[PDB]
Amino acid sequence: KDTENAIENMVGPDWKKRWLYWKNRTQEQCVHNETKNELEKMLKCNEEHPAYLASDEITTVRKNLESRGVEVDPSLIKDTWHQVYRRHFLKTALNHCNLCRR
Amino acid sequence: EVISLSQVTPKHWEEILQQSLWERVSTHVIENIYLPAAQTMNSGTFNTTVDIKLKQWTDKQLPNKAVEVAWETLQEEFSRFMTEPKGKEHDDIFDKLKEAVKEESIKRHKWNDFAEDSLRVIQHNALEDRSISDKQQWDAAIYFMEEALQARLKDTENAIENMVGPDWKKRWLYWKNRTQEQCVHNETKNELEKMLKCNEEHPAYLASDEITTVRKNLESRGVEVDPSLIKDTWHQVYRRHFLKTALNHCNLCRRGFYYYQRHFVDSELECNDVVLFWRIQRMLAITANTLRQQLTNTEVRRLEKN
Amino acid sequence: GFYYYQRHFVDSELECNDVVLFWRIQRMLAITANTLRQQLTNTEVRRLEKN
Amino acid sequence: EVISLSQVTPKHWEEILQQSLWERVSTHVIENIYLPAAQTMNSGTFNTTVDIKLKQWTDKQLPNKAVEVAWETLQEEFSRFMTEPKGKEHDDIFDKLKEAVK
């Protein structure tokens, strides 16, 4: 929950709140949301991807964001990856506990 | 027969020499002069870059290839006049002597050693004068330039189809499939096409960030590609992209200027490639005439004498 | 019309050359004026002040 | 860049060499051997004439055109490496020496 709240701060609210309380994302928030989406797509091909990212992946994500109109600092991608990967690992560990209790 | 060869009209010599010589050097200008010059949006640099190459190229290669074409062109017609059958009637009993005579006569057929010096001056002047004030000059130059570019486009496209293999239309129609390399090329092509889909102005040179990202957008789909495969794929697809753009540029160059109200619209349609093509077409046409004059004034007589 | 668009692949009735000439004249005059202004403000105006 | 050229894969070399030499010899073959030979209805004399002309062309012209192709292709690749890369990052300040050395 701590990671998810930091993530929401990083990327801002979803449409459920933007079109309900008339809020929007900051440019940093949209950039982080797109980087998170790219990293989620990456993790949906390798759910066991290690915590460490190669700079070639940072370059792969930067160019995809450019193809989506977004240019980012490598550390922006690194921090988004840190938070989202930790969230993913925690969800995986929680399902692992759900199997452990069985 | 050799006298009959001396009766060949200049019209045939000039057309044959011009057509043959240009075809020999049609790709050198495109690949080594035009296309790299097309990588900049500065038309002045584009014209400056090619003119320097052409003059250096002109001094070293053009008159040497031009004479060789003329030397061969005369022998090509000579052989046809000499030993070609009169349809189904032919005295083959004479062919041994005819070819034997030719070999001695061609060995003694030493083309004028100073023909190249005249051509260099001619070619420098033909290239130096870039003033095309006549619409007909423009019309002829663009259509022939299109044919050369269309030839390159099909040459690249045919190479690509082998590189990528048949599409689903032929795979299912003829019960064919792709090799694992073709499968890689199709996806490698698709990623490059998507990159160009947005970055239409992407320069021909690829950054290793692009080669690695193209390799990575493919690994994410289970496709691992060596960088060398991407670069080889890139070169063919880029030209197909570029060439279609050039032909569309040519289409608007003729059509856009053709519409009368558009001549006072100063759009970014500087068809400097038609200027380059036109001068070469004229330059070679003059070269052929100089060769033809030497061909009929000195060289054919030497052939007859030999 | 225009310098380039009047010529290439068009049946222009114009053949305009005066515009290029006087445009070049404008550019030469502007460059000369700027050079003169630089010379003035660098040397000549302070020379006059010293005098 | 010259070392990089020296490392170019044989596949590219052979493909470009074949394409260039074919460009050079296709019309020579078609016009001087194939079509003239086509006038006869006896495929055996057709083949005999074709082989004789091919042997003579090999003896006198073909290997010289082949060497020309190899040399000029090497020049073309060498210029591509030496000359301005087809990009935007190039610094022209080295062009004088690169072209003079080329």
Swiss-Prot record, chain B:
Intramembrane stretches listed in the entry: 168-178
Disulfide bonds listed in the record: 253-271
Impact noted for substituting residue 113 to A? In interface mutant 6; strongly decreased ability to mediate mitochondrial fusion
Q: Report the domain of life of the source organism.
A: Eukaryota
Q: Where in the cell is it found?
A: Mitochondrion intermembrane space
Q: Mutating residue 24 to A leads to what result?
A: In interface mutant 1a; strongly decreased ability to mediate mitochondrial fusion
Tell me what effect the entry lists for residue 178 to E. Abolished ability to bind and bend membranes
Question: Annotated region Paddle region: where?
Answer: 133-253
**How far does the signal peptide extend, from start to end residue?**
none
Location of region: Stalk region: 1-233, 271-306
The UniProt-reported impact of residue 169 to E is:
Abolished ability to bind and bend membranes
Effect the entry attributes to changing residue 68 to A = In interface mutant 1b; strongly decreased ability to mediate mitochondrial fusion
Effect of substituting residue 135 to E: Abolished ability to mediate mitochondrial fusion
Record annotation: effect of changing residue 60 to A: In interface mutant 1a; strongly decreased ability to mediate mitochondrial fusion
- Result of altering residue 182 to R: In OPA1; loss of lipid binding and partial loss of function in promoting mitochondrial fusion
- Per the record, what is the consequence of mutating residue 171 to E? Abolished ability to bind and bend membranes
Pull the Mitochondrial intermembrane topological domain ranges from the record: 179-306
Q: What does this protein do?
A: Constitutes the soluble short form (S-OPA1) generated by cleavage by OMA1, which plays a central role in mitochondrial inner membrane fusion and cristae morphology. The transmembrane long form (L-OPA1) and the S-OPA1 form higher-order helical assemblies that coordinate the fusion of mitochondrial inner membranes. Inner membrane-anchored L-OPA1 molecules initiate membrane remodeling by recruiting soluble S-OPA1 to rapidly polymerize into a flexible cylindrical scaffold encaging the mitochondrial inner membrane.
The name this protein goes by in its record: Dynamin-like GTPase OPA1, short form
Curated annotation (Swiss-Prot), chain D:
Task: Tell me what the record says results from residue 60 to A.
Answer: In interface mutant 1a; strongly decreased ability to mediate mitochondrial fusion
Location comes to: Mitochondrion intermembrane space
Task: Please give the superkingdom of this protein's source.
Answer: Eukaryota
- Full-protein residues shown here are 604 to 705 of 960
Protein name, UniProt field: Dynamin-like GTPase OPA1, short form
- Its biological function? Constitutes the soluble short form (S-OPA1) generated by cleavage by OMA1, which plays a central role in mitochondrial inner membrane fusion and cristae morphology. The transmembrane long form (L-OPA1) and the S-OPA1 form higher-order helical assemblies that coordinate the fusion of mitochondrial inner membranes. Inner membrane-anchored L-OPA1 molecules initiate membrane remodeling by recruiting soluble S-OPA1 to rapidly polymerize into a flexible cylindrical scaffold encaging the mitochondrial inner membrane.
Q: What is the effect of changing residue 28 to A?
A: In interface mutant 1e; strongly decreased ability to mediate mitochondrial fusion
